[PDB]
C-alpha cells in the first residue's frame, strides 16, 4: 500500500497472507476453510497465516494453516492476466473470533465511483522498496471502466476494473497482490497488476470477483 | 539467447517472489523482486541456475 495508512489491529479480520518461507501475497478468508487470492500467486506449497497484524512481531493469537489445495481459475492466462483469481482450501478450518473472520461474497458488480478499502503488507514506496511490517490500508474509489481502459489501452478484459487515483501517489504494490478490496462490506476485487506503483495515470488493476461467485461456489462443492 | 544482459524486471503483477538475475556489471547474479507475471528471461529460481546459464 503506497500513500495509505496503518490499519488498526483487528479491523480487517479477513485479511490473510500467503507464505512459502516469506510473505509473497495477500488473501481473503471467505469461508471457514476457503481463501480467495490472485492466480499469479500460485505456488505448489503455500502456508496461509490469519489474524496477522505485525508480520515480524507476533502475539499468541495468529493462526498458521498450510494450504491443502490450490485451485487456479481454468481460464487464467499468464500473458494477458485474464481471470486472475484463485482459491485456497485450508488443511484445518479457521477458528473464527474477534481477530479472524470471513467476508461476504459480492452480491452486485462494483459501481463506478464507489469507495473501497484495499489492504495488504505491500511495498510503501513508488521509487525503491520499503516493505512494512504493520498492515496498511487505503481508501480509494472505483473508477469508470472507460478510464480504466484509457489508462491501459487494449489490455482490459471482462474480468478487470480499476481502483485508485489517476493523479497517482496512492495504490497497492508488490506483495499486496491477491489481497482484498472491500466495498460496502463485501469483497469486490482481488488486487492483480499495474504499471508501476501509484504512478500518474496508472492505477491498480483488480479482478472482478462478482464475475466468479458461480465458479467459486461450484469449486467449494466439488472439493468438500 | 543472450537475455543475461537484460534488466531485472518486476513486471505488472504485484506478488513478491524472490528471484535471481545476472548482474552484467559485477559479473555475478543478484536477487530482485519479481511480481509473478511478465518480465524478461533474465529471471531464475536459484542463484545456481542463474550462474549456470550466464556465469563467466
Residue numbers in the entry:
A (entry chain A): 16 to 34, 37 to 67, 69 to 125, 127 to 130, 132 to 184, 184A, 185 to 188, 188A, ...
B (entry chain E): 2 to 57
What does the paper say about this structure?
We chose the KLK6-selective T11V/G17R and T11S/G17R double-mutant variants, and their corresponding single-mutant selectivity-switch variants T11V, T11S, and G17R. The amino acid substitution that most increased the total selectivity of APPI-3M toward KLK6 was T11V/G17R, followed by G17R and finally, T11S/G17R. The individual substitutions T11V and T11S did not improve the selectivity toward KLK6, rather they somewhat decreased it. These results suggest that residues 11 and 17 are correlated-selectivity residues, which act together to increase target selectivity. For example, we found that the mutations T11V and G17R, when combined, yield a highly potent and selective inhibitor for KLK6, while combining the mutations T11S and G17R yield only a moderately potent and partially selective inhibitor for KLK6. To gain insight into the structural basis of the observed selectivity changes, we attempted to crystallize the APPI-3M-T11V/G17R variant in complex with the increased-selectivity target KLK6 and the reduced-selectivity target mesotrypsin. A structural analysis of this complex revealed that a deleterious steric interaction between the APPI Arg-17 mutation and mesotrypsin Arg-193 pushes Arg-193 into a more buried conformation, as previously found in the structures of mesotrypsin bound to wild-type APPI or BPTI Kunitz-type inhibitors. The steric clash and the restriction of Arg-193 to a single buried conformation can explain the reduction in affinity toward mesotrypsin, which is consistent with our prior structure and mutagenesis studies.
